[PDB]
């Protein structure tokens, strides 16, 4: 799962690099602007850290990152 | 220039095709918005109003207009930055990518023959003819037929060769003295078999084969002569003698086949004069065979040679017998051996190579390893900075086909206009394309510049014209480095000078850590290789400040070595006498470096190399390119003093032509009779192989004269070991002390 | 400085461009993002 | 190492487990949880 928080920082992290768009394609380098909502899902379930107490966490339509995925 | 009704459909046609509307400038009834940054200046008016979209791509420039390619033009690959992953890489070209694709063949082999005499009655070793190298096992099946048979047929169209080739030799054979004739001129020939007549029987009678007389009158024979009587060399002939009984029948499961030919050699063997030269022709020579020919003709003729004329992969050979005179002996001797164990030596590596290759008129799958695999899209928009399928399809592609070729084609149908991408994907790609983390790239400006219609598409596993003697020996050592880079204890490797663009990458196991370096910027983007796997160093070794912090246990100086002498404007000798201890330092083990010495004879090549002696000095293709070089014997010494203990050995491209996978593996052509131009263009540049790691040989004659006894002193803690001598990719010499079978001496 | 054109909103030797620092904004960009274990999470 | 069976989803001794570091995951659990005043609220 990604916690409101969690987004921040990958989006602060995401923003800075945006912020340096004319340069990447002046240079042909890159690959156009990285928004963080194209590693993510949008799957729905119970999010915990175990079956125990992940039973107390329903979310739904919830914005989760996959192993795979965090990894790019 | 005057819109054709197939044009304007292709135009119409390309409109309806679903896509994006233009939304840069917003319709109006009355006013057409005009960019003010752009080229067009309004009229007057009040119907152009000057509207700015908030980010127009387009920038302004024209373009020169470039007549259609007559052929496929092949596309360098070059990479860009943003890569793809390997799992949105593959489907992206599964989604666009033309799998059962059609491919014709064409032809891989074009040359002559790659002859091979063997003295088997000038050996004066006795070499019992019940245990010579039998027919192999494998040899009759299936799968290793289906090849033998395949390569067969991928040879552009043959006894016009092989049968010339036999009288090439046979010419020399010939005395002219009364003392004892041999094929003196105006003697009579015995010929069997004939398709109309033979081609050579036209040559003969013309005296036009030099060396060979003009025979009085030749004799036709054979199942389908059409000139003469039809006999069966197998039983009784009712003809008369003949000086040259030339014998070319085939044989051809094995017992009674053998008897089928110890028969007809037996027949051909007794229509030849008294004193005459009988050539017969065997299909398998088995250790079968050799023990019935030896023990039924052991008297009839005088001398013998084998002379294999390789036109296909066959183990056919041709016999030919001395003076028929009753009283010969003609002894199976070391030779044979030899030369019987070359034959099938090179059997092994003709299959071997072949199996690299799909079975005609079988549609292409990803199965086949020399497959052809393309990639069509229609209309493409190759963008930069962005990946859209289209530019997404073209990584994969070009990925799993780079060491290749690489072909782009533009057809204007007229509906849209398609563009395939094919190449000959081989098994030279699959190693290089595992070593890819990432499928990286490519600059499609080249691609987008194009905006011109080419020749369709023709999908050939093979080129037209045959490889050059130069690449002949080049895939000969791409297959020496994939067997050594093979071994596993090498660990880590760097190779000194490798190209801009790393071409050993495809010649190591994708799970070995290399470091490619060069003075000039590396051609792939090194970012999409794993970093610990391989590492890349720009800079040339020749200067001593590279080799600050660059530590591999294994050092490659091929095909690099002397351009840097000649760019270092240095001595040969002296050159790698600064290279080798810094590969020393460098923390190396084993070294692999294409030096350029004649080893094996000061003698050069016409068009290949010249070897300038005034200053030791090469010139491949005598100017394109000068490089130093240094000789067999001040050069072995001067590295046995720089490496001591080290092991010193000479690998140089084998006669078996075993490293073929990589000449008929990657889809090109070439000339059997070129293997031996090679073969000693190899010898004018061996690959001189150092190992620290073992204690080096002793030599007690040093330039060791041919016929001389001399000792050689193998250091080896162990008595129980076999010492097994190979040379020329067999085996010569096998055996712990007690018993050593030696074919050479 | 040579004029570009539209490869980036703004020319660098554009009409009326501007230096002056203002000790009200202190140029920036983003370099203490958190990462660490407990509060990247 | 003896055999448990259900009290957690994997067995130790287990079939076919893998102590295997990647350079690309370091292990880390949650030590540096924000509490100071000013950050916890
Ligand atoms: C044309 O390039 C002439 C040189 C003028 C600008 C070059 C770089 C120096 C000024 C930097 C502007 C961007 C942020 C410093
Ligand atoms: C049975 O308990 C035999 C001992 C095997 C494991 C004991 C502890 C050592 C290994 C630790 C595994 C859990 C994390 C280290």
Same mark, same amino acid.
């Given at each position: 799962?990604?916690?409101?928080?969690?987004?921040?920082?990958?989006?602060?992290?995401?923003?800075?690099?945006?912020?340096?768009?004319?340069?990447?394609?002046?240079?042909?380098?890159?690959?156009?602007?990285?928004?963080?909502?194209?590693?993510?899902?949008?799957?729905?379930?119970?999010?915990?850290?175990?079956?125990?107490?992940?039973?107390?966490?329903?979310?739904?339509?919830?914005?989760?990152?996959?192993?795979?995925?965090?990894?790019? | 220039?005057?819109?054709?009704?197939?044009?304007?459909?292709?135009?119409?046609?390309?409109?309806?095709?679903?896509?994006?509307?233009?939304?840069?400038?917003?319709?109006?009834?009355?006013?057409?918005?005009?960019?003010?940054?752009?080229?067009?200046?309004?009229?007057?008016?009040?119907?152009?109003?000057?509207?700015?979209?908030?980010?127009?791509?387009?920038?302004?420039?024209?373009?020169?207009?470039?007549?259609?390619?007559?052929?496929?033009?092949?596309?360098?690959?070059?990479?860009?930055?943003?890569?793809?992953?390997?799992?949105?890489?593959?489907?992206?070209?599964?989604?666009?990518?033309?799998?059962?694709?059609?491919?014709?063949?064409?032809?891989?082999?074009?040359?002559?023959?790659?002859?091979?005499?063997?003295?088997?009655?000038?050996?004066?070793?006795?070499?019992?003819?019940?245990?010579?190298?039998?027919?192999?096992?494998?040899?009759?099946?299936?799968?290793?037929?289906?090849?033998?048979?395949?390569?067969?047929?991928?040879?552009?169209?043959?006894?016009?060769?092989?049968?010339?080739?036999?009288?090439?030799?046979?010419?020399?054979?010939?005395?002219?003295?009364?003392?004892?004739?041999?094929?003196?001129?105006?003697?009579?020939?015995?010929?069997?078999?004939?398709?109309?007549?033979?081609?050579?029987?036209?040559?003969?009678?013309?005296?036009?084969?030099?060396?060979?007389?003009?025979?009085?009158?030749?004799?036709?024979?054979?199942?389908?002569?059409?000139?003469?009587?039809?006999?069966?060399?197998?039983?009784?002939?009712?003809?008369?003698?003949?000086?040259?009984?030339?014998?070319?029948?085939?044989?051809?499961?094995?017992?009674?086949?053998?008897?089928?030919?110890?028969?007809?050699?037996?027949?051909?063997?007794?229509?030849?004069?008294?004193?005459?030269?009988?050539?017969?022709?065997?299909?398998?020579?088995?250790?079968?065979?050799?023990?019935?020919?030896?023990?039924?003709?052991?008297?009839?003729?005088?001398?013998?040679?084998?002379?294999?004329?390789?036109?296909?992969?066959?183990?056919?050979?041709?016999?030919? +017998?001395?003076?028929?005179? #009753? *009283? $010969?002996?003609?002894?199976? /001797?070391?030779?044979?051996? @030899?030369?019987? &164990? !070359?034959?099938?030596?090179?059997?092994?590596?003709?299959?071997?190579?072949?199996?690299?290759?799909?079975?005609?008129?079988?549609?292409?799958?990803?199965?086949?390893?020399?497959?052809?695999?393309?990639?069509?899209?229609?209309?493409?928009?190759?963008?930069?900075?962005?990946?859209?399928?289209?530019?997404?399809?073209?990584?994969?592609?070009?990925?799993?086909?780079?060491?290749?070729?690489?072909? +782009?084609?533009?057809?204007? #149908? *007229? $509906?849209?206009?398609?563009? /395939?991408?094919?190449?000959? @994907?081989?098994? &030279? !790609?699959?190693?290089?394309?595992?070593?890819?983390?990432?499928?990286?790239?490519?600059?499609?400006?080249?691609?987008?510049?194009?905006?011109?219609?080419?020749?369709?598409?023709?999908?050939?596993?093979?080129?037209?014209?045959?490889?050059?003697?130069?690449?002949?020996?080049?895939?000969?050592?791409?297959?020496?480095?994939?067997?050594?880079?093979?071994?596993?204890?090498?660990?880590?490797?760097?190779?000194?000078?490798?190209?801009?663009?790393?071409?050993?990458?495809?010649?190591?196991?994708?799970?070995?850590?290399?470091?490619?370096?060069?003075?000039?910027?590396?051609?792939?983007?090194?970012?999409?290789?794993?970093?610990?796997?391989?590492?890349?160093?720009?800079?040339?070794?020749?200067?001593?400040?590279?080799?600050?912090?660059?530590?591999?246990?294994?050092?490659?100086?091929?095909?690099?070595?002397?351009?840097?002498?000649?760019?270092?404007?240095?001595?040969?000798?002296?050159?790698?006498?600064?290279?080798?201890?810094?590969?020393?330092?460098?923390?190396?083990?084993?070294?692999?470096?294409?030096?350029?010495?004649?080893?094996?004879?000061?003698?050069?090549?016409?068009?290949?190399?010249?070897?300038?002696?005034?200053?030791?000095?090469?010139?491949?293709?005598?100017?394109?390119?000068?490089?130093?070089?240094?000789?067999?014997?001040?050069?072995?010494?001067?590295?046995?003093?720089?490496?001591?203990?080290?092991?010193?050995?000479?690998?140089?491209?084998?006669?078996?032509?075993?490293?073929?996978?990589?000449?008929?593996?990657?889809?090109?052509?070439?000339?059997?009779?070129?293997?031996?131009?090679?073969?000693?263009?190899?010898?004018?540049?061996?690959?001189?192989?150092?190992?620290?790691?073992?204690?080096?040989?002793?030599?007690?004659?040093?330039?060791?004269?041919?016929?001389?006894?001399?000792?050689?002193?193998?250091?080896?803690?162990?008595?129980?070991?076999?010492?097994?001598?190979?040379?020329?990719?067999?085996?010569?010499?096998?055996?712990?002390?007690?018993?050593?079978?030696?074919?050479?001496? | 400085?040579?004029?570009?054109?539209?490869?980036?909103?703004?020319?660098?030797?554009?009409?009326?461009?501007?230096?002056?620092?203002?000790?009200?904004?202190?140029?920036?960009?983003?370099?203490?993002?958190?990462?660490?274990?407990?509060?990247?999470?």
């Amino acid at each position: 799962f990604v916690n409101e928080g969690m987004r921040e920082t990958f989006s602060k992290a995401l923003f800075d690099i945006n912020m340096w768009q004319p340069l990447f394609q002046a240079t042909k380098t890159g690959c156009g602007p990285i928004v963080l909502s194209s590693f993510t899902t949008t799957t729905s379930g119970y999010v915990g850290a175990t079956a125990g107490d992940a039973l107390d966490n329903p979310v739904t339509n919830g914005v989760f990152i996959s192993t795979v995925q965090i990894m790019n | 220039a005057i819109p054709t009704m197939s044009d304007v459909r292709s135009f119409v046609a390309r409109l309806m095709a679903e896509g994006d509307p233009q939304q840069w400038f917003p319709y109006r009834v009355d006013q057409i918005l005009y960019w003010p940054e752009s080229p067009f200046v309004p009229p007057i008016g009040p119907f152009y109003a000057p509207f700015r979209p908030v980010n127009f791509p387009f920038t302004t420039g024209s373009y020169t207009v470039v007549p259609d390619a007559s052929r496929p033009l092949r596309l360098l690959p070059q990479y860009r930055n943003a890569t793809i992953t390997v799992q949105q890489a593959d489907d992206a070209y599964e989604d666009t990518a033309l799998s059962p694709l059609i491919t014709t063949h064409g032809f891989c082999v074009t040359g002559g023959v790659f002859t091979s005499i063997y003295d088997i009655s000038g050996d004066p070793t006795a070499y019992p003819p019940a245990q010579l190298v039998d027919a192999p096992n494998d040899y009759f099946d299936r799968e290793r037929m289906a090849r033998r048979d395949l390569f067969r047929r991928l040879r552009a169209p043959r006894s016009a060769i092989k049968d010339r080739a036999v009288f090439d030799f046979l010419a020399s054979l010939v005395n002219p003295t009364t003392a004892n004739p041999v094929l003196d001129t105006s003697f009579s020939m015995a010929y069997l078999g004939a398709s109309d007549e033979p081609v050579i029987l036209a040559d003969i009678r013309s005296g036009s084969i030099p060396g060979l007389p003009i025979p009085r009158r030749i004799v036709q024979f054979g199942y389908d002569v059409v000139h003469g009587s039809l006999l069966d060399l197998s039983r009784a002939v009712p003809t008369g003698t003949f000086g040259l009984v030339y014998a070319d029948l085939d044989q051809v499961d094995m017992p009674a086949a053998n008897r089928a030919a110890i028969a007809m050699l037996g027949t051909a063997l007794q229509m030849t004069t008294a004193g005459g030269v009988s050539v017969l022709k065997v299909n398998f020579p088995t250790r079968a065979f050799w023990t019935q020919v030896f023990n039924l003709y052991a008297t009839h003729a005088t001398t013998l040679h084998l002379v294999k004329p390789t036109i296909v992969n066959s183990s056919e050979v041709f016999l030919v +017998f001395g003076g028929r005179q #009753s *009283n $010969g002996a003609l002894r199976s /001797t070391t030779a044979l051996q @030899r030369a019987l &164990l !070359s034959l099938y030596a090179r059997n092994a590596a003709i299959d071997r190579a072949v199996t690299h290759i799909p079975f005609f008129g079988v549609p292409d799958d990803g199965t086949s390893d020399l497959g052809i695999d393309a990639v069509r899209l229609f209309d493409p928009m190759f963008s930069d900075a962005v990946a859209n399928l289209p530019s997404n399809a073209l990584a994969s592609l070009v990925s799993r086909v780079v060491p290749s070729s690489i072909m +782009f084609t533009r057809v204007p #149908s *007229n $509906g849209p206009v398609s563009t /395939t991408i094919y190449g000959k @994907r081989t098994f &030279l !790609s699959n190693r290089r394309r595992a070593r890819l983390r990432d499928v990286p790239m490519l600059i499609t400006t080249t691609l987008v510049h194009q905006r011109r219609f080419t020749t369709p598409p023709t999908f050939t596993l093979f080129s037209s014209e045959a490889v050059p003697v130069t690449t002949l020996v080049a895939a000969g050592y791409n297959s020496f480095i994939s067997e050594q880079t093979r071994n596993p204890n090498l660990a880590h490797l760097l190779d000194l000078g490798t190209g801009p663009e790393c071409r050993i990458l495809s010649l190591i196991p994708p799970t070995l850590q290399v470091t490619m370096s060069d003075s000039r910027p590396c051609a792939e983007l090194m970012a999409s290789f794993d970093p610990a796997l391989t590492a890349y160093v720009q800079g040339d070794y020749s200067t001593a400040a590279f080799w600050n912090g660059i530590r591999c246990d294994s050092a490659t100086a091929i095909f690099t070595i002397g351009a840097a002498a000649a760019a270092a404007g240095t001595d040969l000798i002296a050159f790698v006498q600064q290279l080798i201890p810094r590969i020393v330092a460098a923390g190396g083990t084993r070294m692999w470096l294409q030096l350029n010495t004649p080893l094996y004879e000061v003698s050069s090549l016409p068009d290949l190399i010249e070897i300038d002696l005034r200053d030791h000095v090469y010139r491949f293709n005598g100017g394109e390119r000068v490089e130093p070089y240094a000789d067999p014997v001040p050069l072995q010494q001067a590295i046995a003093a720089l490496l001591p203990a080290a092991a010193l050995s000479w690998h140089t491209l084998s006669p078996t032509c075993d490293w073929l996978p990589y000449i008929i593996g990657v889809g090109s052509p070439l000339n059997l009779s070129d293997i031996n131009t090679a073969i000693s263009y190899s010898r004018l540049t061996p690959i001189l192989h150092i190992d620290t790691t073992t204690p080096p040989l002793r030599v007690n004659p040093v330039p060791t004269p041919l016929n001389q006894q001399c000792a050689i002193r193998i250091t080896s803690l162990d008595p129980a070991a076999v010492l097994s001598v190979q040379h020329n990719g067999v085996e010569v010499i096998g055996g712990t002390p007690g018993n050593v079978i030696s074919v050479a001496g | 400085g040579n004029v570009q054109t539209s490869v980036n909103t703004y020319n660098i030797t554009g009409d009326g461009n501007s230096f002056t620092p203002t000790s009200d904004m202190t140029s920036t960009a983003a370099p203490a993002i958190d990462l660490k274990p407990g509060v990247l999470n």
